[PDB]
Amino acid sequence: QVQLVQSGAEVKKPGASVKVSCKASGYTFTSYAMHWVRQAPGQRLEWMGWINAGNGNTKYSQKFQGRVTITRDTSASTAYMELSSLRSEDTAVYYCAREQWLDLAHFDYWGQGTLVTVSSGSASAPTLFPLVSCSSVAVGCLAQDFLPDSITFSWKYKNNSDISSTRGFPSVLRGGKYAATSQVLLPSKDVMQGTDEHVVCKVQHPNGNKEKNVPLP
Amino acid sequence: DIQLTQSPSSLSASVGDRVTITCRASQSISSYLNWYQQKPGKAPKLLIYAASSLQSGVPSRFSGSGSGTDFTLTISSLQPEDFATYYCQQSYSTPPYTFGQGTKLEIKRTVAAPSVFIFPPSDEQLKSGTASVVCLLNNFYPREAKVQWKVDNALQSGNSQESVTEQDSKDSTYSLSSTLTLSKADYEKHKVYACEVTHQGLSSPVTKSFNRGE
Numbered sequence: 001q002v003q004l005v006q007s008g009a010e011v012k013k014p015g016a017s018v019k020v021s022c023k024a025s026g027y028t029f030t031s032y033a034m035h036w037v038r039q040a041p042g043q044r045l046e047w048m049g050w051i052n053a054g055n056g057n058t059k060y061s062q063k064f065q066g067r068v069t070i071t072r073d074t075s076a077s078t079a080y081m082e083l084s085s086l087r088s089e090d091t092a093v094y095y096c097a098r099e100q101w102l103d104l105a106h107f108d109y110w111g112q113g114t115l116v117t118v119s120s121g122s123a124s125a126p127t128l129f130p131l132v133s134c135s136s137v138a139v140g141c142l143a144q145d146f147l148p149d150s151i152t153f154s155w156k157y158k159n160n161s162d163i164s165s166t167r168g169f170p171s172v173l174r175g176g177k178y179a180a181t182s183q184v185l186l187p188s189k190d191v192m193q194g195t196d197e198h199v200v201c202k203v204q205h206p207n208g209n210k211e212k213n214v215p216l217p
Numbered sequence: 218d219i220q221l222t223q224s225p226s227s228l229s230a231s232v233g234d235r236v237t238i239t240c241r242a243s244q245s246i247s248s249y250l251n252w253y254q255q256k257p258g259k260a261p262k263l264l265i266y267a268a269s270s271l272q273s274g275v276p277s278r279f280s281g282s283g284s285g286t287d288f289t290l291t292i293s294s295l296q297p298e299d300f301a302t303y304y305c306q307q308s309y310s311t312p313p314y315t316f317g318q319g320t321k322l323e324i325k326r327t328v329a330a331p332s333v334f335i336f337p338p339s340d341e342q343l344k345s346g347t348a349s350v351v352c353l354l355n356n357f358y359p360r361e362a363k364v365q366w367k368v369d370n371a372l373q374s375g376n377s378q379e380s381v382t383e384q385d386s387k388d389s390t391y392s393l394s395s396t397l398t399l400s401k402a403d404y405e406k407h408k409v410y411a412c413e414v415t416h417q418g419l420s421s422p423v424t425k426s427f428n429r430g431e
């Protein structure tokens with residue numbers, strides 16, 4: 001099982017620098033080159049550079065030459081990408097990827113990605129508000145005023161058992177902060193015929209996990 | 218620099234259909250072409266390398282052919298979980314490692330009308346000074362839908378945002394969340410709050426509403 005695991009989300013101001021790590025396992029780290037490829041939200045994949053994990057040789061895209069540095073720690077099986085003089089157009093998900101040289105070159109394994117957000121604002125954890133309706137009944141959760149856009153929802157009953165999650169909705173940007181909704185659909189007859197008066201919405205965010213009781217009608 | 222142009226840019230197809238996507242290179246790249254799949258919020262995944270070699274672990278319905286300037290990726294029997302963006306990428310002449318602009322593949326299925334729910338702002342939010350009114354559209358196809366916010370039957374504009382889920386991996390439907398943002402004062406100056414939904418699966422628009430009291 002080849003695996004590439006990257007560091008967590010980053011929030012930076014314009015002009016600052018950022019360093020992302022990529023830990024490799026499941027193969028001989030020194031035998032393969034590691035490339036870095038970024039993707040702005042909703043945009044094209046954009047190659048940035050590669051480093052030979054063995055001898056440390058690098059090559060960078062002329063678009064990033066002079067502001068990007070790729071390094072490797074062989075004993076930690078880790079590659080690093082540092083980007084300085086960050087601008088708002090550097091806001092993107094940055095991926096490390098292994099290059100398979102056998103036959104024709106190709107990127108066979110990718111890291112999960114690291115969201116780097118460049119913002120004049122500051123990182124903040126979300127604030128949660130319940131969404132209560134005024135067949136299945138819809139119950140919901142509104143997370144507001146969080147940054148970066150790196151949030152995940154989960155739901156639990158009063159008895160602490162998991163509620164089957166439903167398709168998450170993309171966050172929206174407003175006043176430099178993000179907002180997102182989540183929903184669960186509960187059978188109506190089991191809600192009205194039940195002693196439970198609420199469920200629990202939970203959010204995970206790099207700056208603070210939150211919980212909120214959501215009433216049931 | 219070698220440019221890669223993918224066709225079509227968007228494509229809808231039915232479960233079981235044979236689907237073909239093309240990538241054209243500005244100059245010959247021999248067999249140095251790779252195909253990747255990317256689902257929303259996830260990293261690219263290698264499907265094909267060297268124009269026609271299937272990556273280990275990839276279902277056999279994915280195949281590729283071509284050499285020189287014209288290449289094709291074929292899905293021989295489309296599955297619901299194949300909804301995604303597909304990229305070609307050349308590794309002959311680098312840098313740059315060129316990627317195509319992507320082909321977005323949606324699953325075509327029968328029309329399904331949304332179920333609509335409206336949620337007023339919570340008191341805890343109202344004391345913050347802002348009021349968010351939410352409207353959810355659940356389990357509809359096709360993706361095209363229209364949400365119109367109305368406050369005392371006055372059509373709103375410029376004060377709402379919305380987002381749409383990915384296509385469901387089993388039933389191929391979408392869900393959509395829309396938020397209308399007012400100030401506490403403006404929110405308390407009006408009574409009836411409604412979202413009206415227009416969609417192909419509805420013979421007439423469907424409206425959900427509440428009154429600020431209840």
Ligand SMILES: *[C@@H]1O[C@H](CO)[C@@H](O[C@@H]2O[C@H](CO)[C@@H](O)[C@H](O)[C@H]2NC(C)=O)[C@H](O)[C@H]1NC(C)=O
Pocket residue numbers: 157158159160161186187190191194196
């Ligand atoms: C946890 O509590 C919830 C609420 O009482 C239970 O949820 C019900 O589970 C049954 C299982 O057959 C479903 O048919 C109902 O639709 C559920 N109700 C709701 C409102 O979702 C759940 O069974 C409890 N679990 C445990 C382990 O006690």
